[PDB]
Amino acid sequence: ERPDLAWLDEVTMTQLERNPYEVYERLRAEAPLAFVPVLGSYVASTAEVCREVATSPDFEAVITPAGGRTFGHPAIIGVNGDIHADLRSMVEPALQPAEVDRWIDDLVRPIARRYLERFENDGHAELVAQYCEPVSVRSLGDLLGLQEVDSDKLREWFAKLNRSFTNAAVDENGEFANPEGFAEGDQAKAEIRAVVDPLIDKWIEHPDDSAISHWLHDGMPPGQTRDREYIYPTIYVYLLGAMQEPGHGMASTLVGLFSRPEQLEEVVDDPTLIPRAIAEGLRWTSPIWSATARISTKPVTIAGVDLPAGTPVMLSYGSANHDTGKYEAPSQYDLHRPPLPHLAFGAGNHACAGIYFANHVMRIALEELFEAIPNLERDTREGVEFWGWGFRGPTSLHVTWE
């Protein structure tokens, strides 16, 4: 118990979900590594500390308590050594840049057009549900082999898994404050199994181009497949973050550009600026804000704190990307910010494996949107509300045109 941080005792989970920025602005100044009682964990809040923990030889991957309750073992994000190496070898082939470039265009662009065609002549839309999330899940779902799971269902799954994974509040004793908050996630996993089990049955006997078929078969001895219980936790990882984050990234990018109308106009007139707009969007509101963690494997001193071996540290990358030691006025979206390293994809050997793919999905989606609707205007009838501490993004993005 750190005396000068006694105010952290009164920080609530709801506060952090609704708006973590004021608390984390204090943390970055007072204690870049600090134990947050309601989270039951140390959290790293600055760019220097997050990067150090994520790349340190004295830390390894771990899942948070709520995250482990949600995904089980072996979730690619929470394992190390030979298991992690196998899971990385499993997912990396379809994410290799040279491979992505072979097909990303023909994958994403027809999908973006299909969802645009449903509303581009309406003069109003809610872009999160009508465009950003559907493009994100349909693109990845087709790649995975889930062509027959409609986008409504994929979006419901990642929303349920998100809430379950981020169900992190703990009581004074150290147990979960909402032990009922995992039930929704359990139901999503059961629905996922009902859909994927027969697909796995088929792929074992009849492999095809779908990523999950390749997860079963790639690198295995002849006639063998990875056991479904061995790959399911990484399937869940995909059906949460991989499904959710590209849509949140493009939506937050749009919110940011709306907040700088001159910059929105710039990007519409010159869509070669879209990659830069997206990189700034991810820094400005990081889709994975504080979901992942590491655990120390030996005593280590971090930000003046002597940590024993076995100490978990939550990586609040969304706070690190507002580090005022790194950025000028980081709370503002600025397309013309000098390109600088950011931590929205994490760091170290557990950094995002899908960066190149994710950036193209978001790029192609915004290219088609601005081409279809050059005169997008935000519905200023209300402000944009963001939600989430673990994962963060706009809950809706109402716009008009014409």
**Binding interface with ligand HEM (CB under 6 A):** 54, 76-77, 88, 91, 95, 140, 241-242, 245-246, 249, 282, 287-288, 292, 315, 317, 344-348, 350-354, 357-358
Count of residues that bind ligand 3DM according to CB under 6 A? 11
Minimum CB distance to ligand 3DM smaller for 47 or for 77 = 77
Q: Is 391 left (phi over 0), alpha (psi -120 to 50) or beta?
A: beta
Residue 368 has which token pair?
Answer: 């088609």
Minimum CB distance to ligand 3DM smaller for 16 or for 288 = 288
Report the nearest approach of ligand HEM to the CB of residue 232 (Å).
14
Choosing among ligand 3DM, ligand HEM, none, which partner's interface includes residue 235 (Cβ < 5 to 8 Å by kind)? none
Choosing among ligand HEM, ligand 3DM, none, which partner's interface includes residue 240 (Cβ < 5 to 8 Å by kind)? ligand 3DM
- Identify the residue whose tokens are 């799954």: 157
Report the nearest approach of ligand HEM to the CB of residue 243 (Å).
8
What is the number of the residue whose Cβ is closest to ligand HEM?
346
Choosing among ligand 3DM, ligand HEM, none, which partner's interface includes residue 67 (Cβ < 5 to 8 Å by kind)? ligand 3DM
User: By CB under 6 A, is residue 67 in contact with ligand 3DM?
Assistant: yes
What is the number of the residue whose Cβ is closest to ligand 3DM?
241
Report the nearest approach of ligand HEM to the CB of residue 144 (Å).
9
User: By CB under 6 A, is residue 233 in contact with ligand 3DM?
Assistant: no
Report the nearest approach of ligand 3DM to the CB of residue 67 (Å).
6
Report the nearest approach of ligand HEM to the CB of residue 10 (Å).
28
381 is in an annotated binding site: no
Binders in 76-105 for ligand 3DM, by CB under 6 A = 77
Report the nearest approach of ligand 3DM to the CB of residue 90 (Å).
13
Cβ partners under 8 Å of residue 325, min gap 6 = 46, 47, 48
User: By CB under 6 A, is residue 107 in contact with ligand 3DM?
Assistant: no
Report the nearest approach of ligand HEM to the CB of residue 4 (Å).
29
State the SS3 of the chain. CCHHHHHHHHCCHHHHHHCCHHHHHHHHHHCCEEEEHHHCEEEECCHHHHHHHHHCCCEEEECCHHHHHHHCCCCHHHCCHHHHHHHHHHHCHHHCHHHHHHHHHHHHHHHHHHHHCCCCCCCEEEHHHHHHHHHHHHHHHHHHCCCCCCHHHHHHHHHHHHHHHCCCCECCCCCECCHHHHHHHHHHHHHHHHHHHHHHHHHHHCCCCCHHHHHHHCCCCCCCCCCHHHHHHHHHHHHHHHHHHHHHHHHHHHHHHHHCHHHHHHHHHCHHHHHHHHHHHHHHCCCECCCCEEEECCCEEECCEEECCCCEEEECHHHHCCCCCCCCCCCCCCCCCCCCCCCCCCCHHHCCCCHHHHHHHHHHHHHHHHHHCCCCEECCCCCCCEECCCECEECCCEEECC
Binding mask 283-322 for ligand 3DM (x = CB under 6 A): -----x--xx------------------------------
Contact set with ligand 3DM (CB under 6 A): 67, 77, 165, 237-238, 240-242, 288, 291-292
Binding positions for heme b are 84, 88, 292, 294, 317, 347, 350, 352
Binding positions are 84, 88, 292, 294, 317, 347, 350, 352
